[PDB]
Amino acid sequence: KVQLQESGPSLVKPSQTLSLTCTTSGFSLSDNAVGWVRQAPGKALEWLGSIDSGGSTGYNPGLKSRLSITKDNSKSQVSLSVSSVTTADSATYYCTTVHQQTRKSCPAGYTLAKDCGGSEDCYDDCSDILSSHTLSPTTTYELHVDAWGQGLLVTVSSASTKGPSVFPLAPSSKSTSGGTAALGCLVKDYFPEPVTVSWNSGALTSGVHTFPAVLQSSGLYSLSSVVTVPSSSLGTQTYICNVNHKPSNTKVDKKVEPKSC
Amino acid sequence: AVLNQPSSVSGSLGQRVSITCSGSSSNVGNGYVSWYQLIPGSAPRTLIYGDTSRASGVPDRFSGSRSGNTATLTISSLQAEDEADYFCASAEDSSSNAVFGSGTTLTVLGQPKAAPSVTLFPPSSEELQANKATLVCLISDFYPGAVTVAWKADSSPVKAGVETTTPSKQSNNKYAASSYLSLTPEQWKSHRSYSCQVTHEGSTVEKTVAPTEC
């Protein structure tokens, strides 16, 4: 039941501050570390930073000057701010739970000073403490992401948001494959990404495929979603495509009705 | 800062593939490497942590190992669903500082070939009443995922106004693609027919629509 929900703006102008929030459930926020990871389009995963159970934060060294991470245990929320954003900061941003642990081990004979009542150094003879052989402990760092959030796509652009226009792709005799028929919806001219599509409020999942968007020369995106249904059901069963465009807080339901031919 | 992974690795169905992850003494060599699987259109999934420990729900055909500054993710009994991007990671000089690999795309060869099924939608009545016209050509259920799409007006090629998406995987491990032809409603009613022509593995499927036809 460990769930992580990123929230924040989908579009931000250059030089502005990107502020994201992560709402958590299924685990105690005050006893687990939460981290932010991002992935720019076509690039590799990039660590941003984390905050642990004690409230202490660690950041990516190359980006530390632009990053701020805070949390509120009583609200089950963790925040992330990125200052002076540019096009290079366009990415999917992930909230995560992270295992974090530093181990300091000493060889045989040498004892860690934190054990024997340079607290993080080894000592051969704790009785000497002054004439004792001392070394540096073998330090290993453990970090892995446990759970991943669904991610929030953030586009850095000076262009303006635009809600989508949804048009039916109605089946006909030129759209059937015998017992099955294809129908869909064309989601045209929206900005920015992403758009998700479901069918009959999610009650229809088999045969569904939502195609990746295409970038027109106008700067707007378009995509299509298709579903295969029995051809005999076109007269009776009604089919509705549910379009979700969070950047503009738009939801569109479009009934796809069959053509006469 | 960025661990070194091969850009792409290939294997056949049922066979074995190893993905390498090379770093330095301050990350991979420090000895606690993790592995993550990214399927297109899905959140990342943790597969391996602590070099060899397997996360719950991960099949035992995923296995991790490490030798010095190089870690390896081995995938055996290779299945079509394994096609994804794979990233390694480890801490670097702090348990709150992570570095990731450059990523590896896994392709699973030896899957059943399939010719594409093409569906061409004419501009809808609603879009026409908005003084716009888009022809939508949907291509589905083909393998391998490499098609070429061409458009015709009556019988001459059409180059302008065409946008085509790169083929991506469906839920049944077959590939799908889409292509669009944007026209004015006048151009739509001008010619006698429009065609979407898809070439795939020495096969060509062409669908035609006509403004005079329903």
Numbering used by the authors:
A (entry chain H): 1 to 82, 82A, 82B, 82C, 83 to 114, 119 to 262
B (entry chain L): 2 to 9, 11 to 27, 27A, 27B, 28 to 95, 95A, 95B, 96 to 106, ...
Paper passage:
Ultralong bovine CDRH3 knob regions fold with 3 short β-strands connected by 2 loops (Loop1, Loop2) of varying lengths that can adopt a multitude of different secondary structures, including loops, helices and β-turns. Flexibility in the stalk is evident in a comparison of the ElsE family of structures that have similar CDRH3 knob sequences and structures, but very different orientations of knob domains with respect to the body of the Fab. The ability of the knobs to twist and rotate with respect to the body of the Fab likely enhances the ability of bovine Fabs to access recessed epitopes. There is no convincing electron density to indicate tyrosine sulfation modifications in any of the antibody CDRH3 regions; however, BLI experiments indicate that Bess7, with 3 tyrosines in CDRH3, contains one or more sulfated tyrosines. Low sulfate occupancy or flexibility in the CDRH3 knob region may explain the lack of electron density for these groups. The ElsE lineage was the most potent and broad overall.
The cow antibody repertoire contains a unique subset (~10%) of antibodies possessing ultralong CDRH3s, which can reach lengths between 50 to 70 amino acids. The unique CDRH3 structure can be separated into two microdomains where the antigen-binding disulfide-bound “knob” sits on top of a long b-ribbon “stalk” and can bind to both surface and receded epitopes. Ultimately, we isolated a total of 8 and 11 cross-clade nAbs from cow-485 and cow-488, respectively, all of which had ultralong CDRH3s, suggesting only ultralong antibodies were responsible for cross-clade neutralization detected in sera. BnAbs from cow-485 were named Bess, while bnAbs from cow-488 were named ElsE and assigned numbers based on their order of discovery.
